[PDB]
């Protein structure tokens, strides 16, 4: 299950996460990510403090530094 992420400059796309625990997670676990995008944490320093199957994050089409 992919999560709906707001892309800056680009339309809205879905990204596959591990927290979801879906079939996609198994594939990604073997280094088979098709989206290969970075996820941002909304006003959150450590997601470990939260507990949810899915989460909303921001994806960057092109990073500035890394």
Domains annotated for the chain, with CATH where assigned, are: 1-66 (4.10.410.50)
Residue 14: phi and psi, rounded to 5, are: -105, 140
| Determination technique used | NMR
Q: What is the separation, in whole angstroms, between the first and last Cα of the chain?
A: 26
Report CA-CA distances (Å) from 28 to 2, 33, 34, 64. Answer: 12, 5, 8, 25
Report CA-CA distances (Å) from 55 to 15, 26, 45, 65. Answer: 10, 18, 14, 25
The answer to whether the CB of 19 falls within 8 A of the CB of 52 is: yes
Report CA-CA distances (Å) from 34 to 7, 28, 63. Answer: 16, 8, 18
Report CA-CA distances (Å) from 35 to 29, 30, 39, 49. Answer: 13, 14, 11, 26
């Amino acid at each position: 299950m992919n999560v709906t992420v707001e892309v800056v400059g680009e339309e809205t796309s879905e990204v596959a996460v591990d927290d979801d625990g879906t079939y996609a997670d198994l594939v990604r676990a073997v280094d088979l990510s098709p989206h290969e995008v970075t996820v941002l944490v909304d006003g959150r320093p450590v997601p470990e403090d939260q507990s949810v199957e899915v989460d909303r994050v921001k994806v960057l089409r092109l990073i500035k530094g890394g």
